[PDB]
Symmetry: C2
Subunit: 111 residues, 2 copies
Amino acid sequence: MCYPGQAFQVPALPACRPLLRLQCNGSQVPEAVLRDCCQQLAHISEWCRCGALYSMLDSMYKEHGAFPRCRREVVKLTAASITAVCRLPIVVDASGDGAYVCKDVAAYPDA
Amino acid sequence: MCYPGQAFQVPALPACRPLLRLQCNGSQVPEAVLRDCCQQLAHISEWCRCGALYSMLDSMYKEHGAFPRCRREVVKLTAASITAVCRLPIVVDASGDGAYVCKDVAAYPDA
């Protein structure tokens, strides 16, 4: 498993929270804020990148709205594909199947 | 409405079909095939970009498997965020609410 606090820093992905708040209502995202988020994702292993994003999303909602001018549905869809916009692959599960997209995050707060 | 054949060329987004097949199992995507997909998306209006993507995905499934080594769930999640990886905004509905992500495509074959 990907243990919060060691597979990835907690609070998870500080650089990616400002990215998600811009993206979820279609604002323009500066290159620097995209770059910093992706650099932070890059350091986490392929196996744990979706876990870090799940933790981040859960933290934002549990602190909280957490996402001004953003719809619930598009928020969790945007968080689930940040790793795609970074062109960072993830491994879907124990098979080693790869993808660019986090389905567990897209189904938050369940999967 | 976005009419197939006039809001966008049909078959929809030829250049994006190879992108989606690489992405949906986490393969490396060449800059040329990303570029050509985004170029095609860029020409479609903010209002019809998700419609072009829905049409493309539907065609791929209706011709068909359509996605070798890809899971159903990650396929439609990947198609829903091709517009995010291109940094192209869409309008979510009649409100004019913006986003980078197509929720109707993520819910295929329903929404």
